[PDB]
């Protein structure tokens with residue numbers, strides 16, 4: 001029923017805003033000159049980095065903790081998705097283990113543009129080339145993400161659409177090590193059903209956006225494998241970087 005699907009979207013949207021502080025609507029407003037409250041601090045060179053503190057190893061160490069904040073926020077949101085808590089806890093953990101990262105990149109794009117990414121809850125904006133100027137294996141970490149985001153943001157998705165897109169990625173059913181696949185797939189299908197309804201009602205001009213997301217869902221899987229394997233280099237060659245245990249266990253068994 002369309003009505004039940006529309007209710008689920010509003011519910012997930014409400015959980016989405018609660019669980020996640022910075023919304024794409026908010027992020028765009030700051031990334032554009034639409035907001036009058038404040039103009040974002042721009043980190044274009046190391047100097048501006050030092051001015052804002054008042055290096056690549058530190059940047060990622062900072063990215064790590066926010067990743068941990070995100071894991072909590074995603075975990076807080078996953079519980080909101082009806083049917084998640086009633087699943088086998090083993091599968092609940094497994095679903096979050098492999099989905100968390102793919103979700104981070106999806107929402108990171110909301111805070112990204114071709115020029116750079118918003119940082120510090122929208123108070124700052126770090127340039128893409130500055131991140132590229134980490135020619136050490138760190139400078140490669142962010143170029144692929146920017147390219148995906150520009151293409152992903154071309155779909156012109158909004159928070160209402162993203163809320164359901166995230167939920168689908170969580171309730172995958174194809175992730176390794178799931179014990180009861182059927183009940184997970186049952187939830188995803190209804191979530192996919194609601195996504196199609198949302199996209200058609202929210203994106204009239206755009207056609208087959210449902211397919212575009214499904215294709216992008218596959219791309220996110222590769223981007224994660226690139227992050228994991230790229231991390232594999234750091235663990236061996238660059239022992240100067242350390243990994244937070246929770247993330248390190250998530251990275252375990254790919």
Ligand SMILES: CCC[C@@H](C)CCCOC(=O)[C@@H]1CCCC[C@@H]1C(=O)O
Nearest residue numbers: 060063064066067070103104107108
């Ligand atoms: C919902 C958005 C969350 C943003 C703020 C997270 C910013 C980037 O976080 C990362 O990717 C780092 C990158 C390097 C170390 C691993 C770590 C990770 O892969 O989790």
